[model samples]
Target chain A: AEFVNPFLASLMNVLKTMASLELKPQKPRIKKDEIARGDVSGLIGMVGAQTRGSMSITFDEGLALEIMQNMLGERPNGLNEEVTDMVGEITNMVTGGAKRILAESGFDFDMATPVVVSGKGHTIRHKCEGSIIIMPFSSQWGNAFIEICFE
Target chain B: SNARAEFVNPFLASLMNVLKTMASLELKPQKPIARGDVSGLIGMVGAQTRGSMSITFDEGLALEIMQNMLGERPNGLNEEVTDMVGEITNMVTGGAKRILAESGFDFDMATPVVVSGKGHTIRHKCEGSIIIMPFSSQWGNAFIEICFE
Candidate 1:
């Protein structure tokens, strides 16, 4: 609860501010399979002295179009660097936002930056301690995901 | 940092060092664009520079590494094999870090992350030429990609 709330709130903050979208988070589930869902994904790794973890946000291409129009005031014509780079930039904002809230609880660390992936690029998932917690979100656009393996 | 070869050579040497010392295997390096089935990646960050590194392996080669390290024939690319990739990733990065630090490339590396598929692309965190340093062993083949921004 302590760990997830920060990210949940931070993600909400990002969607609310940039895209003017509110998120309705479903119950976070633990799935055993290795494959991640979504057409585009963003991952960031943490290399801290005390602990190691990562955060990933993946989006459907269709949902991305709706959200893109909201954020950019114009939708991406097709999936490309423009969409992927937006995914990367949004992941960065979420990371820093969560880090800020966590620091208030005396938990802080440096990040390795975010790596973005497209549909065909779902070849890897970050290694972390916890069983993967995939939290699904619903928005005016569509269903989105924020998967974390924090410890 | 002097030339492409100068910066990338340390990783080749370190990969050779780790394989030879730990697995009793020698590498015949080939710098080319050939990739493998499974890969382990680590991010590089420091006060002066930031980048990432990866060690990708063919399925046969991945099993061979576990067999050599585990002292038994492996089932396949199981968790055992996956974990070994991460360890080798860690050792290979640290091994190169020592030599690169000597050359004034000092940095901290993140824990290794393992990713596998038929042809999964490794999107490194940094922006630069993604150098591919491939090698062949008695069992199979693999490669290393290190990049900086």
Candidate 2:
């Protein structure tokens, strides 16, 4: 299935909000090639009318820490419990923001609960057996990608 | 198993499934421990169970989990973990709600809101008390606390 422009547009807005809320002065850049580096995270597959797919976010470890630290305005360092929560929380916020926009656009959909997954030497592949639109956002810390794929 | 099942948060089970599918990865049980820093996400579920489920982890472990889940080596914490936590919350609730609804618990759920830190523990002083279950992963330790009425 071809990607919906409204949904894609809403996804862009979600990224903007995420950067704004996290105090990071960066805009999301759309890219076609996948940058295979850093910690890649994938959330639960959101299956509903608007689209049946998943929203995946990936980031560099050092940059990930920096972003979390900056968002929390705390000292940057190790992987603390707060770090995991931040990852989940940011995704949740973006999903919430997108859900609202999508719903308003008449794509009545509800999201699955948020889940956090992390590890080293791991990559996330969210596929619906069709075309995928991957959006990337960059900051001094590193780069983050939001991939939306559907069938 | 029955007692454990009784105490088991159906949400946690469903979350586990979602986690498995979303991360498209697998994890083994490790000795789960506490690491001061706690992060949490809360959502409203009003049906048979009307409350919330939270997943928590230690700092170092949080980094590890992010690494394992993503299948990449992360240098530190940042957007990866933040995004992971949000998705994890959704997965957990989705897992739980499916069971709740299938078991005839009919009710809708609200959007997820995430919060982080290490100080406060979720307090549920309602009619039906919540259940907190601890879990261990190779990367770190975490717990799922459910408070419902």
Candidate 3:
């Protein structure tokens, strides 16, 4: 397995755990076009025994709100400041979960900063510097994807 | 420090410290109500901690942070906010994770999750109970919340 496969597996496991909960992120759906409308994005970089690079996750805005609503066990009218907060939190959970798994595998990885990008029809073009892996998922909330690229 | 200060995870607090450092963006702290953008992005691990961290602001504080980083007023800093926010969050989480490691908690970090908007609100699923704190600075306002079992 590639060095990143273990981490990827662990990440999927964490996402699944969260999905099994109330948020129930739909199975990820992938598309070649730009990120869906109203999607909030979160990203972080990695460095250590592993190569130097970055990873990212994007959530459809509508899906994010829906997921947040499920998380809170309440139905909300629209996306507000609270919904934005919820999306960031979800990304955080995923990152932390992945970190734990990597540690168990004996990878001493340190995390870089998390960048939040907001807008619609945006694309996180992968740079040629590193290997990039883009995985898409969906759920009752909406559509989302995970992008990993090293520089 | 009490391992469980106010039942708050020390690791998480350490992460907050990193976040606080990044939020500075090399700018001096001005008066409150000063608008700035700082965001925290976290992931879940184990059955213990759940949720994320995010703090973001607008142009005024963004400029202020750039000014601090550059030791002077930096012109036209809008394009750089994304990387800044991500870097800040990365620093915050990494610091917190170290504490977590010392405390017998371990996890790997993913790239940051970026979110921005005028009235964006995010809700985290709290299997049990979670604490949410709203902080206001000269730059802008941010909320830090945590959930754990």
Candidate 4:
């Protein structure tokens, strides 16, 4: 609850402020024996004072392009390096925003540089000894996922 | 080279031993492939050594390993399969580190991260050539990549 809500709030705020997109979050669920799939994904490693984990944001190509266009204020014909890098930037913003709020709430942690991966049907897995919360959200353009696996 | 004898051989040996003991599969070394070409990946970090290692598998081989390890045929690369990949990577690194430690090289490894997909590349920040060793089992083929400076 502590870890998931901050990310959810941060994602909503970041999307709204950055892309002018309103994200409606669906009910969060605990993924069981499933691999998270996406066309593009941004990953960040989290190290806390007492805990360590990882976070990832994944988007379909269409949704990613839409968000990128909104952020850049122009629609691109296709996915370019800038569009791919935007995934990392978006993750950084969300992580930074969430970390600040969580730190204020006494959950301080260090974050790693974001790594972005792009490909069709690509899968990312975070191995944590704790529960992994898969939070799905939708915008007018398409759907995306915010996955948090913490210990 | 001496580096191959000292560093690479131990990892290869540990990988073979781990697969034989844990999953009852024998692995044969094949020509190395580019890191991006394969699907599954696990990144590792150490004190004296900081690099990522990846093991890519064909779907059949992955499913076979999962079936051998768990006694049940997994439908796909589920959580169990991913967890098993991490454990395998940890064991392989651990085995190699034990040998290296005996030779006075101390190191520690972080938790392994797994990535699998159709055609995705796992790039390491360390500036050097990555040693990728391809292995083939009776079931199928896989690759073990070690990129350290």
What lDDT does the true structure give each of the candidates? 0.72, 0.52, 0.52, 0.71
Off by over 4 Å in 4: A32-37, A73-82, A119-125, B1-17, B26-54, B74-79, B92-135, B144-149
Candidate numbers, best lDDT first, in rank order: 1, 4, 2, 3
DockQ of each: 0.35, 0.06, 0.09, 0.26
After superposition, candidate 2 runs with Cα above 4 Å error: A1-37, A40-42, A49-51, B1-102, B105-149
Question: Over the stretch A1-151, how does candidate 1's per-residue lDDT look in tens digits?
Answer: 4568788888889988998878888887774564555666666766556666777787767777777788888888876667777787888899889888888987776777566555443334556666667778886566677877756
Looking at model 1 chain A, report the run of 10 residues with the lowest lDDT sum. Answer: A117-126
Tell me the tens digit of each residue's lDDT in model 1 across B1-149. 32323568888888999988888878798757344667777766676656677787888888877777778676666667777888888899898889988877777776666665554444554556667777887778888877776
Candidate order by TM-score, highest to lowest?
1, 4, 3, 2
Model 4 agreement with the true structure over B88-145: per-residue lDDT tens digits = 8778878988987777655554445666765565443333456778888767777776
Candidate 1 has an lDDT of: 0.72
Worst 10 residues of 3 chain A by lDDT: A22-31
**Fnat for every candidate:** 0.30, 0.00, 0.11, 0.30
Which one is best on TM-score?
Answer: 1
Writing each residue's lDDT as its tens digit, candidate 2 over A19-120 gives 442323243334334444435243433545434555656566666687665566675565555666666666666666666766776665544444454544
Error of 2 at B71 (Å): 24
Best candidate, lDDT:
1
- Summarize candidate 4's per-residue lDDT along A1-151 as a digit string, tens digits: 6888999999899988999888889988897656567777776666665766778888878888888888988887765667767887888899899999999888887665455666777777667788878998887677788888777
TM-score of each: 0.77, 0.48, 0.49, 0.72
Query: Residue A150 error for model 2, in Å?
Result: 3.2
Best of the candidates, DockQ: 1
